[PDB]
Amino acid sequence: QREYYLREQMKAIQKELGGEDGLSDLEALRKKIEEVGMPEAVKTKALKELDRLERMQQGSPEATVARTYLDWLT
């Protein structure tokens, strides 16, 4: 029970210092998609690809392909 409490407080202090993300990553990519360009069909294609990317979990080898493709489009 006490080491359960230990991980509870490490999550609380985790958001208190490194849950700071008023700067984020994927929604920063969404804003970057919105502000540059674009033609409208390319913009809808990129937003569908972004939703597909955020639905899956990270570390998978297909998420790296989707991330690199959005990096090249932006």
- Chain residues binding other proteins by CB under 8 A are 5, 8-9, 11-13, 15-16, 64, 67-68
Cβ distance to other proteins smaller for residue 41 or 57: 57
Tell me how crowded residue 72 is: count the other CB atoms within 10 A of its CB.
Answer: 7
Residue in 54, 57, 49, 55 with CA at minimum distance from that of residue 33: 49
> What minimum distance in Å lies between the beta carbon of 9 and other proteins?
5
> What minimum distance in Å lies between the beta carbon of 64 and other proteins?
4
CA distances from 23 to 19, 38, 51 (A): 10, 24, 19
Cβ distance to other proteins smaller for residue 16 or 34: 16
Cβ distance to other proteins smaller for residue 19 or 37: 19
Number of H helices, E strands in the chain: 4, 0
